[PDB]
PDB file of C-alpha atoms in Angstrom:
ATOM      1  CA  UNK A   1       0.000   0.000   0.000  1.00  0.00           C
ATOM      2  CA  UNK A   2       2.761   2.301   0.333  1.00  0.00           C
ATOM      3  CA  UNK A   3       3.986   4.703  -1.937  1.00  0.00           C
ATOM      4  CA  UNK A   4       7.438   6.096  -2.529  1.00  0.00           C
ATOM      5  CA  UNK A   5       7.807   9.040  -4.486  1.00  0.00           C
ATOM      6  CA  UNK A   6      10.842  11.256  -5.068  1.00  0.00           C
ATOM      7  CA  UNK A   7      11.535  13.568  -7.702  1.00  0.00           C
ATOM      8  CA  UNK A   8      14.337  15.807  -8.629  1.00  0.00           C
ATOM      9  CA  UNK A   9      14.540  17.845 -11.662  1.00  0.00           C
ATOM     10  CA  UNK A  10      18.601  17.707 -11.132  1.00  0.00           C
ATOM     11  CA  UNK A  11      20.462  14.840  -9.329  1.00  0.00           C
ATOM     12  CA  UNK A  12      23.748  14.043  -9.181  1.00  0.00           C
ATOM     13  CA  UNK A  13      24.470  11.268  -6.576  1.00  0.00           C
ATOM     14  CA  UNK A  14      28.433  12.249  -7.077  1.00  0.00           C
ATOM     15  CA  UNK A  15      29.553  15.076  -9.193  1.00  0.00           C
ATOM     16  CA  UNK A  16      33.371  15.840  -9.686  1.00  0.00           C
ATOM     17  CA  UNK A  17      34.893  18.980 -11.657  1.00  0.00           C
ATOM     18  CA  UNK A  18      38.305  20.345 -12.056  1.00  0.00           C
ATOM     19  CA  UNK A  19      38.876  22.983 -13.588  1.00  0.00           C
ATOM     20  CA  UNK A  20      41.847  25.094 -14.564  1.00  0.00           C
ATOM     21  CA  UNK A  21      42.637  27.969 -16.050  1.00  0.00           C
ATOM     22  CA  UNK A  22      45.436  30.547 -16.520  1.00  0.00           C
ATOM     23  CA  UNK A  23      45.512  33.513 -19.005  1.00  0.00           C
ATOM     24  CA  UNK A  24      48.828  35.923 -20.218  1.00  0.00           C
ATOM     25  CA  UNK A  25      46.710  37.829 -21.698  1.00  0.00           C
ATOM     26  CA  UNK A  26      45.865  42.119 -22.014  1.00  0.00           C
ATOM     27  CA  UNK A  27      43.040  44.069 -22.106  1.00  0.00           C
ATOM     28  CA  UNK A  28      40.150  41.496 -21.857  1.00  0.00           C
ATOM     29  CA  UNK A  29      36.933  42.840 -21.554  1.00  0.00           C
ATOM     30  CA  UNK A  30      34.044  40.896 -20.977  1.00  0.00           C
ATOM     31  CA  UNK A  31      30.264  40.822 -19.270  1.00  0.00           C
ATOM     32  CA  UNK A  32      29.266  37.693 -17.572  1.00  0.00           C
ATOM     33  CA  UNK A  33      26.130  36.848 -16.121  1.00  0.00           C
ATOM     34  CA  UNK A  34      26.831  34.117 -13.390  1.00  0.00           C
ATOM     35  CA  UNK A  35      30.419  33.051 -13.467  1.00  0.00           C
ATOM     36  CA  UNK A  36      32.261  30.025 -11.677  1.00  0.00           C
ATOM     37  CA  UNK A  37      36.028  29.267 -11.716  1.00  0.00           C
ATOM     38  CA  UNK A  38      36.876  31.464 -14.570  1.00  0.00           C
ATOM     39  CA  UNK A  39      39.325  33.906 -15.395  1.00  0.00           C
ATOM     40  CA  UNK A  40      38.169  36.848 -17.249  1.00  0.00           C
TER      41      UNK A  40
ATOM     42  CA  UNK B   1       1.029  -2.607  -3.512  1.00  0.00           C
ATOM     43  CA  UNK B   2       3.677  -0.713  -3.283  1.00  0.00           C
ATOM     44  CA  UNK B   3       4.408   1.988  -5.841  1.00  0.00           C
ATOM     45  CA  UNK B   4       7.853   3.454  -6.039  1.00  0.00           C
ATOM     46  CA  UNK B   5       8.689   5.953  -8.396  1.00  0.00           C
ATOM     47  CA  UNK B   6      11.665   8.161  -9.224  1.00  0.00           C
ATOM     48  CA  UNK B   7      11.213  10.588 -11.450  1.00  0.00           C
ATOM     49  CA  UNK B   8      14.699  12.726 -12.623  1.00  0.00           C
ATOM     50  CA  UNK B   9      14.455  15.285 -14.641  1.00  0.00           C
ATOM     51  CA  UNK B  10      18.385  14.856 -15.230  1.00  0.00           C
ATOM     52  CA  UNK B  11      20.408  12.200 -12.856  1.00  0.00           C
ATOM     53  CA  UNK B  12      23.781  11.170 -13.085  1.00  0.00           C
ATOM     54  CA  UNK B  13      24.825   9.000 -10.515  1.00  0.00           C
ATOM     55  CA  UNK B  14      28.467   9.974 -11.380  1.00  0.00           C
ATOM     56  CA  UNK B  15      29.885  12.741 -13.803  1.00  0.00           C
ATOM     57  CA  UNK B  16      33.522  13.587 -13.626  1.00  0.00           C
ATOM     58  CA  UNK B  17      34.205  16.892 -15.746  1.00  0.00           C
ATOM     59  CA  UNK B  18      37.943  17.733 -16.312  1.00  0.00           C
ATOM     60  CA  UNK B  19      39.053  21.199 -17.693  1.00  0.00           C
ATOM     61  CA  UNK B  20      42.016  23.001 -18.553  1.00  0.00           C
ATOM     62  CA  UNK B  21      42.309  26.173 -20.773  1.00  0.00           C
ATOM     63  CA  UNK B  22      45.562  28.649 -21.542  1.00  0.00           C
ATOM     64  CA  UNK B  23      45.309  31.199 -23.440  1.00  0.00           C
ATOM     65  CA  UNK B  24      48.089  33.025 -24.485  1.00  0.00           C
ATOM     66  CA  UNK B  25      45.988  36.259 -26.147  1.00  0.00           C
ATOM     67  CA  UNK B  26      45.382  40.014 -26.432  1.00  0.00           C
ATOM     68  CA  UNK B  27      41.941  41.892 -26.465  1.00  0.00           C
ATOM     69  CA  UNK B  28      39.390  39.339 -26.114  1.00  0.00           C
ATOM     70  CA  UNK B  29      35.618  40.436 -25.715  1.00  0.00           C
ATOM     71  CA  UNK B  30      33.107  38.104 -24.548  1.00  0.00           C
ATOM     72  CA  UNK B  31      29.466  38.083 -23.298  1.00  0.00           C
ATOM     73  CA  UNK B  32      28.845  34.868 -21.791  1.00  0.00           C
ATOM     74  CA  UNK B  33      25.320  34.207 -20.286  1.00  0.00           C
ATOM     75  CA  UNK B  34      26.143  31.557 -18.287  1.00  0.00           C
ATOM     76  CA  UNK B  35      30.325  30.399 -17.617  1.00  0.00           C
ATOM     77  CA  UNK B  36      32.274  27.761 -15.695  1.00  0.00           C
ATOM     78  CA  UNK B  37      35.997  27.063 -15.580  1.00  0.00           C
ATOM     79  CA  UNK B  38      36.549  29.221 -18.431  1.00  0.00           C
ATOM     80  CA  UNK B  39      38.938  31.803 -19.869  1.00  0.00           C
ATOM     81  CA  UNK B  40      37.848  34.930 -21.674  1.00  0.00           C
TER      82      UNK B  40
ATOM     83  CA  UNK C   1       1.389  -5.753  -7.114  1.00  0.00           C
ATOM     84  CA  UNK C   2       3.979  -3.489  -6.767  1.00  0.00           C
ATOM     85  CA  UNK C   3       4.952  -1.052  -9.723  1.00  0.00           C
ATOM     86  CA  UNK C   4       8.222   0.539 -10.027  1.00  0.00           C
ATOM     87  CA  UNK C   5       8.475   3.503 -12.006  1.00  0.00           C
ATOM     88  CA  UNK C   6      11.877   5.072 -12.773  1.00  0.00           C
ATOM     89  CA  UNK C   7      11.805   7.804 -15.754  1.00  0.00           C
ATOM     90  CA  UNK C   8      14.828   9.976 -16.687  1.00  0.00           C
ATOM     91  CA  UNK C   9      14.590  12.571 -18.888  1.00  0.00           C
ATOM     92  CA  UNK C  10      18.329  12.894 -18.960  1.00  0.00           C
ATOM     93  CA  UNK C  11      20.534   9.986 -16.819  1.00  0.00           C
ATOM     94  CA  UNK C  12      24.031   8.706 -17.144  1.00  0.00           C
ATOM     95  CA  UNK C  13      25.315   5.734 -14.807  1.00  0.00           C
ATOM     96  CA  UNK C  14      28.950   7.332 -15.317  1.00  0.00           C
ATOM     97  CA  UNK C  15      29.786  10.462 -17.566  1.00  0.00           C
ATOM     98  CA  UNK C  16      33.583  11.610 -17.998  1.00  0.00           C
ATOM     99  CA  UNK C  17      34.377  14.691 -20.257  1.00  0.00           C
ATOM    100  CA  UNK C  18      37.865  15.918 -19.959  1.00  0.00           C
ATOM    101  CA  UNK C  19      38.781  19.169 -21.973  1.00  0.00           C
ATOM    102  CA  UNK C  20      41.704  20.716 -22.838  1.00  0.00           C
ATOM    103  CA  UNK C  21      42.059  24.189 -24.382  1.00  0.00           C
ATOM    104  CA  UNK C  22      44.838  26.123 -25.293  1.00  0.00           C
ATOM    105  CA  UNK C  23      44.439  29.455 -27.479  1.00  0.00           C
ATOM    106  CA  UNK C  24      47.366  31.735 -28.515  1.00  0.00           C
ATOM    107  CA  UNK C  25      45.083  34.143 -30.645  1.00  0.00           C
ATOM    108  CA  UNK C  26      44.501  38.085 -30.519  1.00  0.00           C
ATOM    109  CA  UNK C  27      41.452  39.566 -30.669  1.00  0.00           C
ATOM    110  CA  UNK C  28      38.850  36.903 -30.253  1.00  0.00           C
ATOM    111  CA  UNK C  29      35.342  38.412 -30.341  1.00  0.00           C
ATOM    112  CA  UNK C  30      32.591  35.839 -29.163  1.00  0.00           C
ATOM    113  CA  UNK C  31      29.026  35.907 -27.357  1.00  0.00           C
ATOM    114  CA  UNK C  32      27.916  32.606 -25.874  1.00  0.00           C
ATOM    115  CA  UNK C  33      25.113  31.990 -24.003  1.00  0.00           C
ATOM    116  CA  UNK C  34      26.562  28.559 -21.819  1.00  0.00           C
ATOM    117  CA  UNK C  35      29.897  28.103 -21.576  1.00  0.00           C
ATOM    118  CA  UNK C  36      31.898  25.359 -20.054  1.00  0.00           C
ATOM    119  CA  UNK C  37      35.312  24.847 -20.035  1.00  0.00           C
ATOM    120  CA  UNK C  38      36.015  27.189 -22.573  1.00  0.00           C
ATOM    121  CA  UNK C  39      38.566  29.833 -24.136  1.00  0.00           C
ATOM    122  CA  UNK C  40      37.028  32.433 -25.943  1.00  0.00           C
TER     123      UNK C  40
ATOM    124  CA  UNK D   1       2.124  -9.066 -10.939  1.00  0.00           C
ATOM    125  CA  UNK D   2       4.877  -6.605 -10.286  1.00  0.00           C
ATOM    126  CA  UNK D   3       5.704  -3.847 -13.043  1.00  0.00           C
ATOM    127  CA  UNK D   4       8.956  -2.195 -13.616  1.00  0.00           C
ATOM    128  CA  UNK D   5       9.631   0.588 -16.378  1.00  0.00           C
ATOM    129  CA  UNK D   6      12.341   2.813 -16.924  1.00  0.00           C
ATOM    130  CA  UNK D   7      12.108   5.232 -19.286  1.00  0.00           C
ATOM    131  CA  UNK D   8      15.235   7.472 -20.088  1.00  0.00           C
ATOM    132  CA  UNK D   9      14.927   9.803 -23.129  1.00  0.00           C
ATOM    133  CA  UNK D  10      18.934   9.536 -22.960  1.00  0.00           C
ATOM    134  CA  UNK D  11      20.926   7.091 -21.104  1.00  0.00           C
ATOM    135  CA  UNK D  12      24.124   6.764 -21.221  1.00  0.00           C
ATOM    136  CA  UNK D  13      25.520   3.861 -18.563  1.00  0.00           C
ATOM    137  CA  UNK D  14      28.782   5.315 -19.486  1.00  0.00           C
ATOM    138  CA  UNK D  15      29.838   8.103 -21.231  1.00  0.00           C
ATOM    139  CA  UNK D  16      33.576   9.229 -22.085  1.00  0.00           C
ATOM    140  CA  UNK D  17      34.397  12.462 -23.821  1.00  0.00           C
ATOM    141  CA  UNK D  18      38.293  13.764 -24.520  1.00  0.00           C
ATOM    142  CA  UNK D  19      38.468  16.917 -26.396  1.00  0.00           C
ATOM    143  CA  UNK D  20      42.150  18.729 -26.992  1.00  0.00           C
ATOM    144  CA  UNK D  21      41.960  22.170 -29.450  1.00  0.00           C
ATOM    145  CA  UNK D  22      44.812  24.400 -29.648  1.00  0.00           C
ATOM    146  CA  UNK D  23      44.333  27.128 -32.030  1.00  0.00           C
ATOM    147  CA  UNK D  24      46.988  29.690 -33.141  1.00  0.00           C
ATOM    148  CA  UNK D  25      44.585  32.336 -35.100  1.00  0.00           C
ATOM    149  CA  UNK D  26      44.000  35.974 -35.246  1.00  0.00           C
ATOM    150  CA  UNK D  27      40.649  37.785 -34.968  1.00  0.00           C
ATOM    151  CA  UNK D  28      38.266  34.770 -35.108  1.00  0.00           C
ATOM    152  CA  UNK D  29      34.422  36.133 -34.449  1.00  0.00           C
ATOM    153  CA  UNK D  30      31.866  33.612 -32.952  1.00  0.00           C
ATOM    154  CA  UNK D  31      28.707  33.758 -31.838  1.00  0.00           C
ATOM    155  CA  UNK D  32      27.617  30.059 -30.056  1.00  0.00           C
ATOM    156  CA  UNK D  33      24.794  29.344 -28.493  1.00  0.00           C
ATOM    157  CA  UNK D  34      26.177  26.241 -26.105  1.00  0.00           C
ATOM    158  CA  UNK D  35      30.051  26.101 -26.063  1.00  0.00           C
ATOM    159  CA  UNK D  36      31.261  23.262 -24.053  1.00  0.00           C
ATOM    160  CA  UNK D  37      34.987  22.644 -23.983  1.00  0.00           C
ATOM    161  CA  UNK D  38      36.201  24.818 -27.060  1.00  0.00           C
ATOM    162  CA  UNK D  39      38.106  27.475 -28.010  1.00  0.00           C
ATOM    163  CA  UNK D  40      36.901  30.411 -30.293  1.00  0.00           C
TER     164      UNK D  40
ATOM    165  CA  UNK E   1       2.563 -12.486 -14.460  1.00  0.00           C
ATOM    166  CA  UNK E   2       5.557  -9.327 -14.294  1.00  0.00           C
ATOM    167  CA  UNK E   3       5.734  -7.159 -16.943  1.00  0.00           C
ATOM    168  CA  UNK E   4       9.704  -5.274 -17.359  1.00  0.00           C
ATOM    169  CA  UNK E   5       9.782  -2.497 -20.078  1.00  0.00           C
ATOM    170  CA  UNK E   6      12.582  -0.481 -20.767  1.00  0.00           C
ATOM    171  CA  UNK E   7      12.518   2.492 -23.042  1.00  0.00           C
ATOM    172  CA  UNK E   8      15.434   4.575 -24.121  1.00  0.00           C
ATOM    173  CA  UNK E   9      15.026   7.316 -26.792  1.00  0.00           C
ATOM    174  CA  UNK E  10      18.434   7.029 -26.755  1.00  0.00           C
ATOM    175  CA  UNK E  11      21.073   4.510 -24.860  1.00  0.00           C
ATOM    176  CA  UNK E  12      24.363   4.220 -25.023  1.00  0.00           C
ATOM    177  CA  UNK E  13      25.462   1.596 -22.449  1.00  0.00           C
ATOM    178  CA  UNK E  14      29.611   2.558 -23.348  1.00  0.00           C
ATOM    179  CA  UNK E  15      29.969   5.334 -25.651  1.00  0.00           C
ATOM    180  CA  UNK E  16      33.628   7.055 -26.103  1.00  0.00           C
ATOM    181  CA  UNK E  17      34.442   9.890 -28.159  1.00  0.00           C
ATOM    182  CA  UNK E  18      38.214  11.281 -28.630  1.00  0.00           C
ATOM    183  CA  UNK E  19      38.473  14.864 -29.989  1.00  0.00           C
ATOM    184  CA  UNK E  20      41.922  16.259 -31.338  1.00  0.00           C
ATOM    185  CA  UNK E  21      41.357  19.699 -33.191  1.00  0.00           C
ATOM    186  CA  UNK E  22      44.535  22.330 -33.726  1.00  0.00           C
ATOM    187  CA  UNK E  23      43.679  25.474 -36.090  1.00  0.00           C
ATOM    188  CA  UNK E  24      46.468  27.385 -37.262  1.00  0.00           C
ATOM    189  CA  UNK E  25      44.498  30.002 -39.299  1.00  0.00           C
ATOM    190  CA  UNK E  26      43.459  33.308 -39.411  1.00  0.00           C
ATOM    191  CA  UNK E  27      39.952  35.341 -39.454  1.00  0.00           C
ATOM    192  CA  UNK E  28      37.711  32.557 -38.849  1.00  0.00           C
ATOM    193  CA  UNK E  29      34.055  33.515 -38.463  1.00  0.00           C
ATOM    194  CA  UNK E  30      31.370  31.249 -37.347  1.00  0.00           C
ATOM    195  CA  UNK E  31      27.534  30.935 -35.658  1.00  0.00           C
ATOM    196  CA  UNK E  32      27.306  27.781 -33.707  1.00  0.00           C
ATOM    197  CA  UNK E  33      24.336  26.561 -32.483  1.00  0.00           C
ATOM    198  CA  UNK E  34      25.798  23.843 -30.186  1.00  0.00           C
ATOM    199  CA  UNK E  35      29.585  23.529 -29.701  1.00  0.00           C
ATOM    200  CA  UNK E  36      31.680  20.854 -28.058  1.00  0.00           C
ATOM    201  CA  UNK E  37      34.826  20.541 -28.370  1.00  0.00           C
ATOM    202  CA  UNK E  38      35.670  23.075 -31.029  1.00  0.00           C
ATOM    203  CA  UNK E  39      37.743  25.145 -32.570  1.00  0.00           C
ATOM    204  CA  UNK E  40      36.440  28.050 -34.293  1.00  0.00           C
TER     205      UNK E  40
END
């Protein structure tokens, strides 16, 4: 009789990420609207 | 009688995401809407 | 009796992306609206 | 009597992905809508 | 008396994919819809 419902619209049960990043690089101009582990 | 149900909209039980950027370069211009782990 | 239900719109058991960028260029001009891992 | 369904629109049990770019070149212009791993 | 069903728009159970790209040229211009693993 019982019921077992679960919903997610995202799971992960493990998520891993590297990331890296260097830049040399002048005059970089830029407009971002949510920004993780970047370099501009 | 039981009902179980999973409902995902996206699941990953495991993702592994691996990034590396250089970039060497002048006068970049960018308009990202969304970025992660990234060089502009 | 029982029912078991299990939709995904999106699932993977196991995902690995690894990415490597490298950019010398000047003067890259881009808009993106997602970006991951990623030299403009 | 029990039912089981899975439905996945994609599945992947496993999924690898390598990507390496290096690019050299001047003034490249790019508009992308989804950039994953690339470099413009 | 159980009924199993499995549907997958799309299943990979093992999928790789290997990228290599290097672009020496100049004044590349391109729209993307989607990108992975590109070089513009």
């Amino acid at each position: 009789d019982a019921e077992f419902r679960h919903d997610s619209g995202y799971e992960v049960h493990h998520q891993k990420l590297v990331f890296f990043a260097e830049d040399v690089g002048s005059n970089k101009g830029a407009i971002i609207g949510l920004m993780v582990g970047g370099v501009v």
